[PDB]
Amino acid sequence: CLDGKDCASFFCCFEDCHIRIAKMDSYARIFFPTAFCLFNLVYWVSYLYLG
Amino acid sequence: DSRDYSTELSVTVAVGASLLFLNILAFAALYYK
Amino acid sequence: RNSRAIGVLWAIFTICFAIINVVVFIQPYWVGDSVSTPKPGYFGLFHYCVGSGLAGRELTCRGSFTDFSTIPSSAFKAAAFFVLLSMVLILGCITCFSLFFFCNTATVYKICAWMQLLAALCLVLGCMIFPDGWDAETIRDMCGAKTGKYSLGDCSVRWAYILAIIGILNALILSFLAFVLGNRQ
Numbered sequence: 052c053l054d055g056k057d058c059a060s061f062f063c064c065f066e067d068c069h070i071r072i073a074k075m076d077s078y079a080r081i082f083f084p085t086a087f088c089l090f091n092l093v094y095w096v097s098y099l100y101l102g
Numbered sequence: 103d104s105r106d107y108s109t110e111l112s113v114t115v116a117v118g119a120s121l122l123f124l125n126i127l128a129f130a131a132l133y134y135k
Numbered sequence: 136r137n138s139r140a141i142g143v144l145w146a147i148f149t150i151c152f153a154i155i156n157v158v159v160f161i162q163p164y165w166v167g168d169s170v171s172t173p174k175p176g177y178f179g180l181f182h183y184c185v186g187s188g189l190a191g192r193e194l195t196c197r198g199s200f201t202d203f204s205t206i207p208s209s210a211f212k213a214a215a216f217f218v219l220l221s222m223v224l225i226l227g228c229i230t231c232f233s234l235f236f237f238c239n240t241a242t243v244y245k246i247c248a249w250m251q252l253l254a255a256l257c258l259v260l261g262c263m264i265f266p267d268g269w270d271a272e273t274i275r276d277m278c279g280a281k282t283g284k285y286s287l288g289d290c291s292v293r294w295a296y297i298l299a300i301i302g303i304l305n306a307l308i309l310s311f312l313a314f315v316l317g318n319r320q
C-alpha cells in the first residue's frame with residue numbers, strides 16, 4: 052500500500068504455500084551438513100583464539 | 103590507566119558508521135531500481 | 136547482473152553482521168571502569184573480571200554462560216539468552232543461504248527477512264534488559280554505590296555495547312533489505 056503491497060502479503064509469502072514435503076531430503080542433504088559446519092566453526096573459534 | 107577508552111570508542115564508532123553507510127547506500131541504490 | 140550483485144552484497148553484509156553478533160556475545164568488555172571507580176575491572180553478559188587491588192591489578196576473572204551460578208543477576212541471564220537466540224537465528228539464515236539451489240529466491244529472501252527481524256527483536260530486547268542487571272551487588276561494589284538500574288555512575292559503556300547497538304541497526308537494515316529483495320525480481 053506504500054511503495055510495497057498488502058502488509059500481510061508483501062511480508063508473508065502465504066501465496067503458493069505446501070505439499071512440497073517430498074523434496075525434504077534434497078533440502079536436508081545441504082541443510083544438515085552446512086549448519087553443523089557453521090556450529091563447528093563457531094565452537095572452535097569460541098574456545099581456541101578468544102577463549 | 104586510560105580509564106575512559108575514548109580512542110577505542112571513536113574507532114569502533116567510525117567502523118560501525120562506515121558499515122551502516124555501506125548498507126544504506128546499497129538500500130538506496132536498490133530503491134532507485 | 137545487478138540482481139545477483141545486490142544479493143551477494145546482502146549475503147556478505149549478513150555474514151558481517153553475524154560476525155559482529157558473535158563477537159559482542161562472547162566478549163566481556165561491555166561496561167568499563169573510570170577514575171571515580173573504586174575497584175578497577177570490567178564485566179559483560181556472563182564473563183567478568185574484577186581487580187584485587189593488592190599491588191597492581193591482578194584481575195581475577197570469573198563467569199561463563201555455561202554456568203548459571205555465576206551470573207550476577209537474572210537480567211544478565213535473560214540478556215545472554217536473547218543474544219543466544221539472535222546468534223542462532225542469524226546462523227540459521229546463513230545456513231539458508233545454501234538452500235537457494237532448491238527453493239525459489241522469492242521465498243528464501245523472505246525467510247531470512249523474517250529470521251533477521253526476529254534476531255533484531257531478540258538483540259534489542261537483550262540490550263534493553265542488560266542495564267536492568269546493574270542492580271547486582273557485585274556491579275554496585277565495583278562501579279560504585281550510585282550505580283544502579285539505568286544508572287552508569289562511575290562506569291561507562293565500552294566498545295562492545297555500542298557495537299551491539301551497531302549490530303542492532305545492521306540487523307534492522309538487513310531485514311528491510313531482504314524484505315524488499317524478496318518481492319523484487
Ligand SMILES: CC(C)CCC[C@@H](C)[C@H]1CC[C@H]2[C@@H]3CC=C4C[C@@H](O)CC[C@]4(C)[C@H]3CC[C@]12C
Pocket residue numbers: 086087089090093094097161199200201222223226227
Ligand atoms: C546450528 C545452528 C542453527 C545454531 C548453532 C548455535 C551455536 C553456535 C551456539 C549454541 C550454544 C553456544 C555456546 C553457549 C555457551 C558458550 C559459553 C561461552 O563462555 C562461550 C560461548 C559458548 C561456547 C557458545 C558458543 C556458540 C554456541 C555453541
Ligand SMILES: CCCCCCCCCC
Pocket residue numbers: 080081084
Ligand atoms: C547432482 C546430484 C547430487 C547433488 C547433491 C547436493 C550437493 C552435495 C551436498 C553434500
